[PDB]
Write a protein that binds this ligand. Structure first.
Ligand code: ATP
Ligand code: A1A4F
Ligand code: K
Ligand code: K
Lengths: 292, 99, 164, 49, 360
């Protein structure tokens, strides 16, 4: 037994070193597990007290302020603007601070919310976040698509098997692509649209809006789009305003934003200018000159 | 890993689209699929470790039983028994590394 | 016998390092030349968007950029190499921003006139397709003619009326 | 050195890719180094046994 | 037991772009290198030393440089080795002669009273240290023993002479006395007679006077010539601004050493703003002089970094007259008081003086 002592000690030390090396990563994982946040719940009864789905869109901002860095240096200062229910209003600002604040406040993603918002006559913070995001369509700045079957990609959570979704997808855009795809409704994506038209994101957003029947629509800036793409986007916005009766457009293109009931701009951490009619923006030539 | 990297790359979009659980279902399915192979690997390495640990003891037992019963030509002198044990302990290391 | 010929490719190539190091490409850093190149390429707004600016881990295994941005980086590096011969492979086909292309063309023209060096820009840029610079036509795996710009006018087929 | 003196024809670029050659360098060189490390064992262990 | 091997099929493939070193980055403000310490002991490290045995050639010098305990140990070891060797030689001689054998005294023993190695060692001790008990006498019929005795006496005399010389040389050392010199903890710079100067205080503790006092001032800094030369530690001599220019001084009470900063002085373009800690500046003062007791030159080395310079300060008076003599309060050696001076450099001060002269 004495002869084996040296090899036993050597193996013990080597295994202890390896165990410590692996336990370093184990401790890193455990420390990462200590980051507990993002509690998806509501401080009210969500059975029947809130609306099943916001349709009127009668939301009144009452001195709403949003900040990220622990409620410090907010991008909004008592924002209280009267939105137009039952109509599409597109607010375009030269600076992206207003659009970012609006996007954060729409889904309550802002870290700090100094104010009150009545979402369709009900509180926004007292509603399920999952339901709120499911019943509110939104587009992205850049085309982002997952890799999977279109039936399992367009409405994975809804899991609706109606052929109306496929009909709407083939009618909105990429009819030739849908016809050429052997799967069709259940066609699998190719590396998340690695080789696909730039309008795939817009088509997916339109299909999601059609499926979920989200009355309120949220729009973001377009990094790059052709004239035909812009015309199709405008047609989709008009269709949403006709059917869903609510649409919100946020971008920096004055020509696109002019096709809306109301226009507003926010800059320097506060509201810059609000124009209830569309012609009021053209009345103030400063914003028109800045845009073009 | 490729699937979860695809999920995390568009994590903001997935969170805003309320499809996190929908994709997590496929994540769990793939995790079970990999866990089956991981369990097979664990079983195979358990068998390997058990054989490695039990081979020398079984060989020593067989040698001693054979010498005592079949041969019975010696009184099992310690000078032979412990020498054989030391030789087996020495030869254990090359045997499990030759493969 | 071949010198340090500057080259560009249709598929951009990037170094998994900082943007400034990738642009320099193991070359001495001159502030004046770097500022002139970045002003010509209009890469300052792109650097402003980046968190670390030129210190961001550009390329693979790090920060991934668009094809136009990668082409901007490649052409900026090629210009900053400051070689007597510069080659391009569709620099404007990938990125067709008219203002940026015109600014880069003007900067390249000024720099090459100052240096009196040969520059080859293989592209389908119809905006500067007719010019006082020499032209060469390639089709069916052969060179049709490499001479003055008036040769194209003398030919019966004027590049399908230059897509006018 | 071989990479520096390697042709750039598509017939070879599309056959042995950059990822493939990187995996080759990562794996084959390491396993050959391990074989060099274990080379005395194959000479000694049978004789010792 | 055993372990596993480094079999890496693909290194997890996706395991990349981790970054985030999270290094402490505490080495930026670790420390500042000093040419010499406040108490001499130049902190300079030598590298690539190609010695050819000259270190061991100076055996006497090495012995002198050895400390007192080391010298005592070497003395004891050498004497014990010599005694043991001579005792062994005597024992071998006795054994060869056969007198060691306990036999009849028919033959005259080579050395009398020899019975064991202990007796041989006692005889060797008596011979070498010249004790001479006489019980162990040397016979006249042992010429080899006579020759060994002669050799042992010669070796003992030579060893005694060498040890005495080494002891005298070690006693002549006065480095500890040289350490008794006192220099200001922090130096000051202030105007004198309308001229800026770098003042410093130096004093001595022991009442013994040091003769031929000579102080040298130099500045150690990295200087690059316009021709492109790069000198890592350039040393430039600094005058003491003496009345006659010589470095000879008469130090009884702690005196103030001041150097007038002229245009030719390298300190002519220095500002208090650039007098921070991490500054390429170090003042070295070397004091030389012989001791009235030992007559051996002694050297004092001190350093003053930029952070150790007290801009716009004045040393307090230290000498106070008494009823019959003068008194020095050594507790006031390092006490200084602020002196109102302009913050401009020496160059700017001279330029302002020239502008004032031109205006007037
Ligand atoms: N009265 C004294 N007796 C002996 N050494 C002294 C005396 N005053 C100062 N020193 C020496 O001066 C050096 C500087 O350190 P220290 O801060 O103790 O002195 P100092 O700045 O002269 O102080 P003080 O305020 O006493 O004049 C030290 O080596 C210290 O031993
Ligand atoms: O005990 S060994 O020396 N082990 C060892 C591994 C390395 C890797 C280095 C070299 C490669 C790069 C990392 C560092 N250095 N040393 C040992 C030596 C000879 C035979 C058997 C062993 C035991 N063995 C084998 C596998 N695991 C333990
Ligand atoms: K004597
Ligand atoms: K005597």
């Amino acid at each position: 037994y004495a002869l084996m002592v040296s090899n036993y000690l050597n193996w013990m030390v080597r295994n202890l070193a390896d165990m410590e090396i692996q336990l370093g990563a184990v401790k890193r994982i455990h420390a990462l597990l200590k980051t507990e946040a993002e509690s998806y719940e509501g401080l009210l009864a969500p059975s029947l007290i809130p609306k099943n789905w916001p349709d009127q869109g009668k939301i009144q901002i009452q001195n709403l302020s949003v900040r990220y860095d622990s409620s410090l240096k907010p991008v909004l200062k008592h924002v209280n603007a009267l939105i137009s229910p039952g109509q599409k209003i597109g607010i375009c600002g030269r600076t992206g601070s207003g659009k970012s604040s609006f996007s954060l406040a729409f889904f309550r993603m802002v870290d700090m919310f100094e104010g009150r918002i009545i979402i369709d006559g009900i509180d926004i913070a007292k509603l399920p976040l999952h339901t709120l995001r499911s019943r509110l369509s939104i587009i992205l700045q850049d085309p982002v698509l997952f890799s999977g079957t279109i039936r399992f990609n367009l409405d994975p959570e809804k899991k609706c098997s109606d052929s109306t979704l496929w009909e709407a997808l083939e009618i909105a855009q990429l009819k030739l692509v849908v016809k050429a795809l052997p799967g069709g409704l259940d066609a699998i994506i190719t590396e998340g649209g690695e080789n696909f038209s730039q309008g795939q994101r817009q088509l997916f957003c339109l299909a999601r809006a059609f499926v979920r029947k989200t009355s309120i629509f949220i729009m973001d800036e377009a990094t790059a789009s052709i004239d035909m793409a812009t015309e199709n986007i405008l047609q989709k916005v008009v269709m949403t305003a006709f059917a869903d009766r609510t649409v919100v457009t946020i971008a920096h293109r004055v020509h696109t934003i002019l096709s809306a009931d109301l226009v507003m701009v926010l800059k320097r951490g506060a509201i810059l200018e609000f124009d209830k009619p569309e012609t009021l923006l053209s009345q103030k030539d400063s914003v028109f000159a800045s845009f073009v | 890993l490729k699937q979860t990297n695809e999920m995390l790359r568009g994590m903001k979009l997935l969170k805003l689209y309320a499809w996190e659980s929908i994709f997590c279902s496929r994540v769990e399915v793939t995790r079970r699929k990999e866990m089956t192979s991981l369990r097979a690997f664990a079983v195979y390495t358990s068998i390997s470790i058990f054989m490695n640990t039990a081979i020398p003891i079984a060989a020593v037992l067989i040698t001693f039983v054979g010498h005592v019963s079949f041969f019975k030509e010696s009184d099992l002198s310690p000078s032979v028994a412990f020498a054989s044990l030391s030789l087996f302990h020495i030869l254990v290391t090359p045997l499990f590394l030759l493969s | 016998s071949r010198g340090p010929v500057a080259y560009a490719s249709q598929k951009p190539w990037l170094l998994n390092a900082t943007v400034e190091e990738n642009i320099t490409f193991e070359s001495p850093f001159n502030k004046q030349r770097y500022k002139m190149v970045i002003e010509a390429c209009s890469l300052q707004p792109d650097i402003d968007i980046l968190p670390h600016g030129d210190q961001t881990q550009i390329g693979e295994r790090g920060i991934n950029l668009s094809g136009g941005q990668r082409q901007r980086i490649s052409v900026a590096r090629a210009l900053y190499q400051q070689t007597n011969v510069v080659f391009l492979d569709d620099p404007f086909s990938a990125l067709d921003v008219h203002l940026s292309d015109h600014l880069m063309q003007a900067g390249i023209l000024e720099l090459l006139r100052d240096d009196k060096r040969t520059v080859v820009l293989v592209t389908h840029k119809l905006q500067y397709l007719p010019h006082a610079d020499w032209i060469i036509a390639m089709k069916d795996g052969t060179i049709q003619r490499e001479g003055t710009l008036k040769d194209f006018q003398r030919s019966e087929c004027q590049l399908f009326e230059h897509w006018k | 050195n071989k990479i520096m003196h390697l042709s750039t024809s598509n017939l070879s670029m599309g056959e042995m890719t950059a990822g493939q050659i990187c995996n080759l360098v990562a794996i084959d060189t390491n396993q050959l180094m391990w074989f060099f490390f274990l080379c005395p064992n194959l000479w000694a262990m049978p004789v010792q046994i | 037991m055993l372990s596993r091997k480094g079999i890496i099929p693909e290194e997890y493939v996706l395991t990349r772009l981790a970054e985030d070193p999270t290094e402490p980055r505490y080495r930026t403000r670790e420390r500042r290198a000093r040419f010499v310490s406040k108490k001499g002991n130049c902190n300079v490290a030598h590298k690539n030393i190609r010695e050819q045995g000259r270190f061991l050639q100076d055996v006497f010098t090495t012995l002198v440089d050895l400390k007192w305990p080391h010298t005592l140990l070497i003395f004891t070891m050498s004497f014990l080795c010599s005694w043991l060797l001579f005792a062994m030689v005597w024992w071998l001689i006795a054994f060869a002669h056969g007198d060691l054998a306990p036999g009849e005294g028919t033959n005259v023993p080579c050395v009398t009273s020899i019975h064991s190695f202990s007796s041989a060692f006692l005889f060797s001790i008596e011979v070498q240290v010249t004790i001479g008990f006489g019980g162990r006498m040397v016979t006249e019929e042992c010429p080899l023993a006579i020759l060994i005795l002669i050799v042992q006496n010669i070796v003992g005399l030579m060893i005694n002479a060498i040890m005495l010389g080494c002891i005298f040389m070690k006693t002549a050392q006065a480095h500890r006395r040289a350490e008794t010199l006192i220099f200001s903890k922090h130096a000051v710079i202030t105007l004198r007679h309308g001229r800026l100067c770098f003042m410093l205080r130096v004093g001595d503790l022991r009442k013994s006077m040091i003769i031929s006092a000579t102080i040298h001032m130099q500045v150690v800094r990295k200087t690059t010539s316009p021709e492109g030369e790069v000198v890592p530690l350039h040393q430039v001599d600094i005058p003491m601004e003496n009345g006659v220019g010589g470095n000879s001084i008469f130090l009884v009470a702690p005196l103030i050493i001041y150097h007038v900063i002229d245009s030719n002085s390298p300190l002519y373009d220095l500002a208090p703003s650039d007098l921070h800690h991490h500054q390429d500046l170090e003042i070295i003062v070397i004091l030389e002089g012989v001791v009235e007791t030992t007559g051996i030159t002694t050297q004092a080395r001190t350093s003053y970094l930029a952070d150790e310079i007290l801009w716009g300060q004045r040393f307090v008076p230290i000498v106070a007259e008494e009823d019959g003599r003068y008194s020095v309060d050594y507790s006031k050696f390092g006490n200084t008081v602020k002196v109102p001076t302009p913050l401009c450099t020496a160059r700017q001060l001279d330029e302002d003086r020239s502008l004032l002269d031109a205006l007037t």
